[PDB]
C-alpha cells in the first residue's frame, strides 16, 4: 500500500537527472548533488540513541522512524537516516533494523536482503585487496610482505564462525604461499 | 634358553675391545673392525628372496634364519644378516620380521621394539634437519628456501596416518612461517 519512489523523490524536489531507480520503490541519489546544495541552509539534526542495550530489546530504530513520521505529521518536514542492515544476521535471526509494527522503512525485505548492492560492493573491494596481496606474494613478493604480519582480513556478509580462523594458500606452488587468515 | 652374548661373540672370536653390550644378550660391534679384517678371506654369500608376495604370507625371514641354523647344523659356519624391523608396524599387527616358531632371532621382544636404539638415532638426525630448516627460514631465510618446494619430510617410527599431511608453523611470528609438511 505504498508509494512509487517518484512520489517520495518529488516530496524532496529531486530531479531524474540525479536519481537512479532500483525497481519501482527505491532510488540512489547522486552524491555529487550534495556539493550542489552547499550554499543551502542546514536544517536541524536530531541524534537518536539509547540506554544500555538489554536482551529485552529497546526498539531504537523503530523509534527513530516513528519520530521522523511524527514530525512530518505535526507539519515539520523530516527525513530519517539509517544504517543498512547486514544480511548475515537476518539469516540467523529476525531483527529490528528496518523498524517494527506501524513504524518501518519499506520495502523491508529488499532493505534487509540485497537492497541496492552496497554490501556486495564493499565486500568485492575488500576481497580484491586480499586477492591482490596474496598474488603479489606469489609472484615474487617484491614488497617483502611478512605473511605472519598481515593485518588485512577477508570478508563476507554472512554469519560464518567457520571462517574466523583459517589457513589459506595450500595445495602447492601453483596456489602460492600458505598463511593464516 | 638363551646364550649370553659373550658366548656368541666368542664363537666369532670377537674381543671385548670392539664389543659394546646392550644388556646381557645383545651387543654392537665396532664397524671399524671390518677394515681390520680387510686382508682376511671372504666366505660365501647367500641371497634369500621370494616369489611374488601374497597375503597368505611366505615366511621368507623365518626361512633365512632357518637356513643359517641348518648350515651350522650340517657343520658349515653361518651367520644370518637381517634388517631391523620398524617398531610402528608391531604396535599395529604381529609380524614375521624376527622369524617364527622354532626359527627366530632372539631376544625377540627387544629386537621388535627399541632394540639398540638405531631407529631412534635415525629419527633424531632426520628431525634435526627438519627443525633446523624451519628455523633457518624463521631467522631470515638467507638460503631463500621456497616453502612450497621442500622435499624433506619429518619422521617417526609409528604407524600414524594422521601425520601423512599436516600444516606446521602456525600461531604467529614467534613460531615461524606456516607450511605444509
Curated annotation (Swiss-Prot), chains A, B:
Organism for this UniProt entry: Thermotoga maritima (strain ATCC 43589 / DSM 3109 / JCM 10099 / NBRC 100826 / MSB8)
Entry similarity comment: Belongs to the formate--tetrahydrofolate ligase family.
Gene that this sequence comes from: fhs
Residues of the full protein shown: 1 to 180 of 542
Covalent S-S links between cysteines: none
Name of the protein in its database record: Formate--tetrahydrofolate ligase
Highest taxon, organism lineage: Bacteria
Residues binding ATP, per UniProt: 54-61
Amino acid at each position: 500500500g505504498m508509494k512509487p519512489i517518484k512520489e517520495i523523490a518529488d516530496q524532496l524536489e529531486l530531479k531524474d537527472d540525479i536519481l537512479y531507480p532500483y525497481g519501482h520503490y527505491i532510488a540512489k541519489i547522486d552524491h555529487r548533488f550534495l556539493k550542489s546544495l552547499e550554499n543551502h541552509e542546514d536544517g536541524k539534526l536530531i541524534l537518536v540513541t539509547a540506554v544500555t542495550p538489554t536482551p529485552a530489546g529497546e526498539g531504537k530504530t523503530t523509534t527513530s522512524i516513528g519520530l521522523s513520521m511524527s514530525l512530518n505529521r505535526i507539519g515539520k518536514k523530516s527525513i530519517v537516516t539509517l544504517r543498512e542492515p547486514s544480511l548475515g544476521p537476518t539469516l540467523g535471526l529476525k531483527g529490528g533494523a528496518t523498524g517494527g509494527g506501524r513504524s518501518r522503512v519499506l520495502p523491508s525485505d529488499e532493505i534487509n536482503l540485497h537492497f541496492t548492492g552496497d554490501m556486495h560492493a564493499v565486500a568485492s573491494a575488500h576481497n580484491l585487496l586480499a586477492a591482490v596481496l596474496d598474488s603479489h606474494i606469489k609472484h615474487g613478493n617484491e614488497l617483502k610482505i611478512d605473511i605472519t604480519r598481515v593485518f588485512w582480513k577477508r570478508t563476507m556478509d554472512m554469519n560464518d564462525r567457520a571462517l574466523r580462523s583459517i589457513v589459506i594458500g595450500l595445495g602447492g606452488s601453483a596456489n602460492g604461499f600458505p598463511r593464516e587468515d
